[PDB]
Design a protein around this ligand. Sequence first.
Ligand SMILES: OC[C@@]1(O)OC[C@@H](O)[C@@H]1O
Ligand SMILES: OC[C@@]1(O)OC[C@@H](O)[C@@H]1O
Ligand code: NA
Ligand code: NA
Lengths: 266, 266
Amino acid sequence: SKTIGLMVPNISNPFFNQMASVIEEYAKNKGYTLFLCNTDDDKEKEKTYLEVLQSHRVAGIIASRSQCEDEYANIDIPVVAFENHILDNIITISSDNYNGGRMAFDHLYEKGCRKILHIKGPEVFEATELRYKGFLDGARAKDLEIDFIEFQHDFQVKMLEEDINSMKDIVNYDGIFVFNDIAAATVMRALKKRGVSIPQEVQIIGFDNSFIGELLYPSLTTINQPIEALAYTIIELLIKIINGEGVLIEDYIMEVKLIERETTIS
Amino acid sequence: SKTIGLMVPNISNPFFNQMASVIEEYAKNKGYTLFLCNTDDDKEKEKTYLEVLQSHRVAGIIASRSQCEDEYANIDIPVVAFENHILDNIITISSDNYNGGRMAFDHLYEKGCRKILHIKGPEVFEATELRYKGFLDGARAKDLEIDFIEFQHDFQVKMLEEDINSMKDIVNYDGIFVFNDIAAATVMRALKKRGVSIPQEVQIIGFDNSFIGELLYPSLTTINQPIEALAYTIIELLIKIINGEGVLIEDYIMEVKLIERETTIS
Ligand SMILES: OC[C@@]1(O)OC[C@@H](O)[C@@H]1O
Ligand SMILES: OC[C@@]1(O)OC[C@@H](O)[C@@H]1O
Ligand code: NA
Ligand code: NA
């Protein structure tokens, strides 16, 4: 087989469809095509696709935001993981989510925010947990108390029909850090429906630098994940495993950077 | 195998991510999993994926906005097509794109628009050609001259860094019909960057009812494609072909409807 299976939480999140496009490019450079498999952050869908990919004898699997552990132990096909650690013998590639969360706090604080909310991601996403921890560590360094709201899912179309309890109070914050750009878009939509002015009344920073942050208005200040470097790295390492080349099985963490746009003041 | 290959022409476009999610649900109801294959509206990528899916002996293929023809002749795997016709012995499922184009014209005209632009899709998309023809036939019935601008691609992230020549003149139109909702979002972003008020200065209608129109602000008036009915139908018909059950090979066209939101005046 010259096909690699890429498991995607959902390509409805712009970040994952862009990642899938760029991984496909790097795979093509190495002579591979891709099958994309939608796992929807569901352990049983992931298990099913692992079985289906194995039965189809793909050359390798890229496992994004995995919720398994067990299931991977016997599979005899090369695997690399994006974000979530699976087993100690599978390489995990990620952005520097801890430091990105610190950068997000430092940016809001530098822009004068003192009443701060972090809309954090589901606990099962190692990446969002690290963003939360970096943000909180930043607040602790400034002796600032922060409020949290924890979403239980990444973006789903149903989110557009869901309310936040006490949405009327959100405008009272100086700044809000939202765990990713697509979730930030939903938060800004809710604020706009209530007539809230951004950034005049509240400042917003997201995470990813996915296309949704530039597509909408005002454009979203965010933390860049380096999709090209992530995709390059994932494919380079998977091909080493496929080829039986030596590589230390350890974390590969790519640098992030602040992208200042119109939802924070300057 | 119990796997169906779904060719996806634009994994960046909300409409196709939502279609893929719903097709997956209906396939699961019938006992099938899906592999998604990114064709990127490229004939060579489609040809490649067709070969890869055949080599993997999938149970059936859902072609989507296909640009091939003879490559499908005697591939001995069941195929159904979304939108673009492939061969006379392959069923094509689509929304009622001609009537949706007429509905879009009628709605702008009823809201008082007389200086009207249609940003039309690539000529290789049968669906957008029919939207253009329905819109134009509506204009001709009212003895109204319409202007056209023809995009050569569906949404790509690079569109966010591309300008329309004479963009500063677009505000002069009363109303704009854009060939789909994700393209409409890009047009609205350009207008907003220039300080144009929607719908006060220009009214906008898209096509699809994909989730981006409900993230847009103001929310986007559009023509609904019935994703649930499309997905149900694609899977029902593909399973008939797989099972060798009788079915007339003919067009299946699903009804569309206007969804009035905030980018046209109520
Ligand atoms: O949008 C993608 C993302 O930011 O969502 C949360 C995190 O898991 C991932 O990197
Ligand atoms: O967005 C999806 C879509 O509207 O794009 C153009 C048309 O091919 C298709 O139905
Ligand atoms: Na505030
Ligand atoms: Na106008």
